[PDB]
Amino acid sequence: PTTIEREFEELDTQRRWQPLYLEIRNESHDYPHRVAKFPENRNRNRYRDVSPYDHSRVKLQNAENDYINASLVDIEEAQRSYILTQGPLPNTCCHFWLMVWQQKTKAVVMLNRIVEKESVKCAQYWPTDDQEMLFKETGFSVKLLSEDVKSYYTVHLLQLENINSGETRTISHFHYTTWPDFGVPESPASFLNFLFKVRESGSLNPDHGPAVIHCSAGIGRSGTFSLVDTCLVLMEKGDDINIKQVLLNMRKYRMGLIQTPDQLRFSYMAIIEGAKCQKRWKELSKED
Ligand SMILES: O=C(O)COc1c(C(=O)O)sc(-c2cccc(NC3CCN(S(=O)(=O)Cc4ccccc4)CC3)c2)c1Br
């Protein structure tokens, strides 16, 4: 048994999952988020209590208002960087794609549905048919090139076009459609099969900008996705990681990563199961 599997069992048999989560909540460093609280930025925030820190927020270069609810999560020991953002609002979809272009982002990971429990969690920021989606405020257009519908997720091939310079770029849109809000995936196998499909696409490689991970608020399910992938990269280096400390370090870049104790427990399960690294996952996932 590994040092992660022994801690997992002790946390399970002793029922210490919620106190561990409360420890992470209390040990979380608070940082200034003044730009997010400006009066001009009220219509750019989906939730009042979810704001990006000033020191790590992503800036929209050369725009009149450079604010977007997006945080750059840097893990130097892992050579990995993610942009965790909220589900775009109808008026910030143009800022979302300007950010994707400026940061040279290759992949967009979506872990939420457009509609969840009688509420819209994210605007339809990519086209569903062959019609062009225009974003004139930032001068961008998005076309749906191809889509691959699996059982519990869909991969869209999107063409992001700079309508001013004519330059186009292909974007891989991974849409996890069966991850409930404030909940966990069906199994560690279905999540790891999705995470490794993102890895196998080369869109997390250093030849690209940071991938954009987003759900509804960009801290709950997005934090669970980011913590597992970061830990799986750190353990490949040969480090005996402390999952609690890796999460608290990530929480210095964006507040409230991982929202429920069950999401934290699932992170331990996915890290333990993913540590053994796959074809088994694809079959257990039942994506076909
Ligand atoms: O993806 C999911 O699973 C769920 O996604 C979701 C939502 C959805 O999908 O509908 S809503 C939502 C939400 C909206 C407002 C406030 C809070 N909760 C607050 C609680 C307090 N925290 S915090 O980070 O603990 C505040 C803090 C900052 C720094 C230091 C200490 C505390 C912010 C979020 C959560 C989250 Br999350």
Side-chain angles (χ1 to χ4, degrees), residues 187-202:
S187 47
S190 36
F191 172 84
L192 290 164
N193 179 63
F194 176 85
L195 170 57
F196 272 87
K197 189 84 173 282
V198 174
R199 289 172 158 213
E200 216 82 46
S201 67

Side-chain angles (χ1 to χ4, degrees), residues 16 33 55 61 70 74 83 94 123-124 132 134 146 159 185 204 220 229 247 265 271 273:
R16 304 213 50 80
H33 46 275
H55 71 266
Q61 297 147 204
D74 230 318
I83 289 172
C94 52
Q124 187 64 54
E132 209 188 14
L134 256 298
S146 205
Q159 169 153 101
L204 301 182
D229 181 50
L247 173 61
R265 176 170 182 280
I271 283 159
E273 181 58 39

